[PDB]
């Protein structure tokens, strides 16, 4: 099976450092990307870091730009991070994920298990209009996210990934290119929109659906997420 | 002008002019499209290259000559052409000797160099040949002046002219000769040593080239230092004077030499032509 | 303008760069052809130099052979016969023992294909070849000889009978004796002259 | 200095 | 009874000779006088694969019409991004000497064969991200030729032990043997229906499989020399061939003997591959004579040239959305037509 | 002692006769048809427009 395990967080005063690792085992390592994903302690998901395979390319986020320090150990298998600096606002939790790329990959399939870390004392704009709706079991629910610009490639297709939160553990892929259903996923979900008008259609619904949905994107560096919908039985 | 002499230079200018261009410039492209796929394509497109810019250079002279030894250009240009003209010449030199160079190791030690060989080595060898030219040509980058009476182009010189000259003919015609010498002759007694590798074309091949680098490299380079020990008393002066422009036109032969032996030893030359 | 074709260019590129170091790391090994008849002990100097294709592998002074073994399959030779073009040289062999390897000889040495690859020659068994002919005359094989009943002479009429089956002047023969391990010498040797001649005729020169 | 030398050499 | 039995399959011969001819009314030359003819046409490179190092023995479209597969000598396979000439996989090979590949329909497998007497299967849908060796099959006698998918679980292959077979990849066993020629097969092409399959062997026969029964139900002799080539028409009830002694020609499965030849006194060198194009009127064939060609497969005439390799052409293959045709020869470069 | 193998050839043989057959015409006519049919959706005969040409 599949891991991506993370360790290296705990507490830090102000103006320390500290190093963080995911290592991973049981797939090819080589071919891989690796991602670093933030969540605040009572917020939504963010973006930080990018590494490319066999350290080929690097990209960073306006806010960690000159902060932080990112490293790839293929014969291990490891990523690491460097923590230089941290300010009095950046206490969250830390993943690492997988982003293949080529002809009709599947990004971001896996997810990390996550670390807390504690500390003492032109873009491309997501949103979701609501934030906690009540659902009766056995019906159907539709939900929205629209963007500011049209997400709409020369090549045809667009880049729009729907993401799942159940309430306990890391999120899991449910759709990507808005059109496509990952692996393992049942055929009641659905895909629909054009331009900047998003939404997804679910019907038949089960208790194991509860959770928190975020929208993401993947046209052009840097990656925002959105808010964040809650659902609840009845 | 109404010496014998200048008529047949011009004459002969012209001629290597509109012969040499065509060829080298055919050669260029077929060997630029095939320097992607074999390491044995490198040494002819610098060999091409360098004697394309050295023949497109000939209507400067011809002009030049036409004239009456004028230098009706700027200030600018009187301490460019000649460097540039230096380098072409010697990078062609160089180059030749370098291939030779390198027909000696093949035929020699197959085993090594199978298991050396490259394109980085070739383009190794190349530069090295190329800045020794550069090294060689500075004297004429640095000293380069020029005057006005009417304007002459020429070089202020304040021994310099003795060692310049000096070093000139050495570095220009002895190790080529050698390295030409020594490595054909040696190829040739191998190959002609075992029935397998025996062939009568490879004889006829070396023979022309180096007898034709010979007649032609060697009347220039023996009057441009009989210039460097004479006084101005002799008429032998006014004889040899008399012969600048010849010399120079019987010089540039090689430049036309080349395509035409490098295309006429091949395998197939139309169909290259027609693939690119 | 390309979102996340970058990506899929980057990996293009390390592919294509993998392929190219593969391939010119594998250019070092020469490939040898064994042919003949059944029973001709092929598989025998094959073991003495230490189901469809057996292949073989074993280096000698900086440079590693490879061998090929293909009369393990019995269909249509001209069918797959041009699989093997390309190849360095040609391993034969001969059993002075037994006319069906004169003949595929001769078909062999006058194939389009193989019109300019050297062929390398094996006469083996030589003991009990010499002691049947001191003990028995080869006028059963070849009414039409004549001559002694001793050793040098009855090879070298069988050689001679071998070397007249070619047609093209531009291919050439080598022939030697076997039955001390002495043959990676030979074999080194026709390389080594093939890889001259091949390395002066890409110059240019010949 | 005050020295011709038709270019070419 | 040895002679008895010769005489009464010498009648029978004479027989089934005598109902083809009296079925035979007449050519396809008269009906076809009234048919417009296409013209000339001509064909223009649109691209150039370039990342093959040896000779080019195979290749197979894809179901999208996007992704190619190639295989050579060189010992790789490589799954090729048609549109922007990008490359997706490169697979290593156990043995260098290949001589087919395949292209599953759902697009998560691909096959390949040689002179190993050995079929294998890739996965290439792995959630470990590579490509693995799903499984190899291993019953025949002969070298491989050719090699098809009917579903992701049915392989037919054609050995060169005189037979065709129907695998099961599931289980690796032989699940129906089809018998009956009389020498090495090498061709294969599967009905638009998935239920019937023709094959060309190196006796210049052919015949008409059953895939569920098993038993082979006509047979047409009427070339010269080997087989080398084969295809479906489009519409089902017909298929064409090429042969060796540098002529093709279109037979018929319901008049049960052939209808129109395709020659030419210059051409000389044999035949290679041929296809057929969307709509079955053009009849695309490769030659030994460093090029293609285009037959009109109606009125037998010829109608353009499609020239541009410098050694013989070795693969042929049109697109399912029928835009574009693809060429291999042995001086490792593939050119996509349009 | 090849009676078995020589009975299968007679017998395939006696199938393969019972078969029917249908003339020439008819399947001549059959085939040029549907050639007919779909002569505007073959975009190689007739030349397909640069604007929706994938490989342009």
Known sequence: DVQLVESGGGLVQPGGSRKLSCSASGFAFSSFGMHWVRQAPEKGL???????????????????????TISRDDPKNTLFLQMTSLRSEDTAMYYCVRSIYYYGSSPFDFWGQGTTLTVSSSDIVMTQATSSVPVTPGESVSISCRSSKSLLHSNGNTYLYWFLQRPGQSPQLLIYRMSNLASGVPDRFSGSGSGTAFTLTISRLEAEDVGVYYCMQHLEYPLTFGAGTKLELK | KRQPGDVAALIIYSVVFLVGVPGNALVVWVTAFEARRAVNAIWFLNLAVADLLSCLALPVLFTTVLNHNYWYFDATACIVLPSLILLNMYASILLLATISADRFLLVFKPIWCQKVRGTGLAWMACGVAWVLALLLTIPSFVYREAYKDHTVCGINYGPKEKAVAILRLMVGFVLPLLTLNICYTFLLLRTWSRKATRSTKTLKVVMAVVICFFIFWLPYQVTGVMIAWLPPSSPTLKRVEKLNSLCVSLAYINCCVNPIIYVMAGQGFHGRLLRS | LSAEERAALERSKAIEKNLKEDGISAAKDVKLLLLGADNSGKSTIVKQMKTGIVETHFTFKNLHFRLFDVGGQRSERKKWIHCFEDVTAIIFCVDLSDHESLMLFDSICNNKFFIDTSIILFLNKKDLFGEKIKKSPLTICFPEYTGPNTYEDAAAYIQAQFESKNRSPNKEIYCHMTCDTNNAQVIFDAVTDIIIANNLRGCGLY | SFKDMPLXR | ???????????????????????????????????????????????????????????????????????????????????????????????????????????????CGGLDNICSIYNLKTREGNVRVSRELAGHTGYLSCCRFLDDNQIVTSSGDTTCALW??????????????????????????????????????????????????????????????????????????????ATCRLFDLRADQELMTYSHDNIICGITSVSFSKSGRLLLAGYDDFNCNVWDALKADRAGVLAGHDNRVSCLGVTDDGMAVATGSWDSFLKIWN | ASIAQARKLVEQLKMEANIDRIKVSKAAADLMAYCEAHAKEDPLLTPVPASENPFR
């Not at chain 5, 992704?67 to 090979?93: C, E």
């Not at chain 5, 029964?213 to 298929?239: V, Y």
Request: with cysteine; proline share 2%.
């Open chain 1, 46 to 68: 963010e973006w930080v870091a990018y590494i490319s395979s066999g350290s080929g390319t690097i990209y960073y986020a306006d806010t960690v730009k000159g902060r932080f």
């Open chain 5, 168 to 245: 099961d990849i599931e289980t690796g066993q032989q699940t129906t043997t089809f018998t009956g020629h009389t020498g090495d097969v090498m061709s294969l092409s599967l009905a638009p229906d998935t239920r019937l399959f023709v094959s060309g062997a190196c006796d210049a026969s052919a015949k008409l499989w059953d895939v569920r029964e098993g038993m082979c139900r006509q047979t047409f002799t009427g070339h010269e020399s080997d087989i080398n080539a084969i295809c479906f028409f489009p519409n089902g009830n017909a298929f064409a061939t090429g042969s060796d002694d």
């Open chain 5, 1 to 111: 009874e040895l002679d008895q039995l010769r005489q009464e399959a010498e009648q029978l011969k004479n027989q089934i000779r005598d109902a083809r001819k009296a079925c035979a009314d007449a050519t396809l030359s008269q009906i076809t006088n009234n048919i417009d003819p296409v013209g000339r046409i001509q064909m223009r490179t649109r691209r150039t694969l370039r990342g093959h190092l040896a000779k080019i023995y195979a290749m197979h479209w894809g179901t999208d019409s996007r992704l190619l597969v190639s295989a050579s000598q060189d010992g790789k396979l490589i799954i090729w991004d048609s549109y922007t000439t990008n490359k997706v996989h490169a697979i290593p090979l156990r043995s260098s000497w290949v001589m087919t590949c395949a292209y599953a329909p759902s697009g998560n497998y691909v096959a």
